[PDB]
Write a protein that binds this ligand. Sequence first.
Ligand SMILES: *[C@@H]1O[C@H](CO)[C@@H](O[C@@H]2O[C@H](CO)[C@@H](O[C@H]3O[C@H](CO)[C@@H](O[C@@H]4O[C@H](CO)[C@@H](O)[C@H](O)[C@@H]4O)[C@H](O)[C@@H]3O)[C@H](O)[C@H]2NC(C)=O)[C@H](O)[C@H]1NC(C)=O
Ligand SMILES: *[C@@H]1O[C@H](CO)[C@@H](O[C@@H]2O[C@H](CO)[C@@H](O[C@@H]3O[C@H](CO)[C@@H](O)[C@H](O)[C@@H]3O)[C@H](O)[C@H]2NC(C)=O)[C@H](O)[C@H]1NC(C)=O
Ligand SMILES: *[C@@H]1O[C@H](CO)[C@@H](O[C@@H]2O[C@H](CO)[C@@H](O)[C@H](O)[C@H]2NC(C)=O)[C@H](O)[C@H]1NC(C)=O
Ligand SMILES: [Fe+3]
Ligand SMILES: [Zn+2]
Ligand SMILES: [Zn+2]
Length: 341
Amino acid sequence: YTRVVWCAVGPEEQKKCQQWSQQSGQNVTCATASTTDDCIVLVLKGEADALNLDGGYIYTAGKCGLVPVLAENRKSSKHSSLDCVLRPTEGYLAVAVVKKANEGLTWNSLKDKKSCHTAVDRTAGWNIPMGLIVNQTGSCAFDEFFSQSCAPGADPKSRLCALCAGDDQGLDKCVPNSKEKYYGYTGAFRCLAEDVGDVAFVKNDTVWENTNGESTADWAKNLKREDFRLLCLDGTRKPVTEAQSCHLAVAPNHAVVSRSDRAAHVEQVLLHQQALFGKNGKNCPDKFCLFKSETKNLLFNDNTECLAKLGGRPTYEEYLGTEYVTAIANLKKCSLEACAF
Ligand SMILES: *[C@@H]1O[C@H](CO)[C@@H](O[C@@H]2O[C@H](CO)[C@@H](O[C@H]3O[C@H](CO)[C@@H](O[C@@H]4O[C@H](CO)[C@@H](O)[C@H](O)[C@@H]4O)[C@H](O)[C@@H]3O)[C@H](O)[C@H]2NC(C)=O)[C@H](O)[C@H]1NC(C)=O
Ligand SMILES: *[C@@H]1O[C@H](CO)[C@@H](O[C@@H]2O[C@H](CO)[C@@H](O[C@@H]3O[C@H](CO)[C@@H](O)[C@H](O)[C@@H]3O)[C@H](O)[C@H]2NC(C)=O)[C@H](O)[C@H]1NC(C)=O
Ligand SMILES: *[C@@H]1O[C@H](CO)[C@@H](O[C@@H]2O[C@H](CO)[C@@H](O)[C@H](O)[C@H]2NC(C)=O)[C@H](O)[C@H]1NC(C)=O
Ligand SMILES: [Fe+3]
Ligand SMILES: [Zn+2]
Ligand SMILES: [Zn+2]
């Protein structure tokens, strides 16, 4: 009865969640929904307990009363061995990536080009770049900025979905889940790699994890970091090695959210689950690994070292940071006392 019901977004996450359920002796069970928003609703209804969310979604969930529980913490050597679970998160770098061969393309010549986004409402893939663009063009018509895009979650018949490809069969074009070929960090980077789009709004880690043999996936196998460039806000282009001096923003880390009344129980179960299936986990590589799914970033990002305890029991606004919260509210003024549900 102590059981935590995880919410999986789409069939692939559902399959991984089921594997996790089996290996956890049903200490974790699965609820599945087609989109992250639907999962948030299941949690609000009490039909699911938790799921790991990108900051843009933490904002949506938070307005609905859901809270931060634990955050993804990426192998980053700083904070010596203050162990992982106790190490404070540093956030990730949201970047704009283009092909080096696409010369002359800069942050200042993005209008009318083709873009690849992780998903509508996500932090590196949407909130940050579109916020910056609405800001600079002084206009809310962000649906008109890029000539075509793949922005999972947007209207499928719109130009924002024109570049999306759907699943092996063309079904689910533009759905905001892994069934869409170009969905998420890896999908948006793939959209760029395959030259479907001119620019990809992802995070620094994505570029590294899908180049120079780091991915053995067929579209990624042959990719070289030097064939890519980051777009700096000052109009310059730099090597992906320059991320720290050429990013759009620093993003909150993805984090597990739950209803406030279930947060303590979810935290407890998760800490026990990663002890078993996390990076150095007792049953990881071996029976199951919570943080692996072949660069597909299912349930959690594949580069997650551990889920870390938060500092000073954050409200969702403290967790996301005042800078980011303001940016989202300002951007959403184009589409304050919320919960869209
Ligand atoms: C941009 O994002 C990348 C990827 O997240 C950052 O680069 C990573 O930096 C980490 C340290 O800050 C490196 O972590 C360790 O990874 C392994 C652990 O075994 C060590 O060797 C590696 O072996 C693996 C597997 O064969 C390879 O993927 C690596 O090439 C590497 O040789 C490594 O010494 C280190 O201790 C991590 O490797 C590294 N990842 C990659 C793919 O380069 C980068 O810092 C970040 N930039 C910014 C500005 O944040
Ligand atoms: C695009 O839209 C607006 C244009 O400025 C941006 O919102 C503004 O963001 C700044 C920076 O976070 C806010 O400034 C802050 O002011 C508060 C007090 O007013 C202070 O506590 C902070 O130290 C900081 O100085 C500013 O308030 C905010 N303004 C309003 C009225 O919303 C937005 O950030 C831009 N979008 C992006 C993605 O950059
Ligand atoms: C399901 O969860 C329970 C704990 O809530 C796991 O079992 C206990 O774990 C502690 C510490 O890890 C052990 O010291 C206890 O003795 C375990 N209880 C017993 C009675 O075995 C339990 O193993 C989990 N189930 C699986 C299959 O992972
Ligand atoms: Fe994100
Ligand atoms: Zn910065
Ligand atoms: Zn506080």
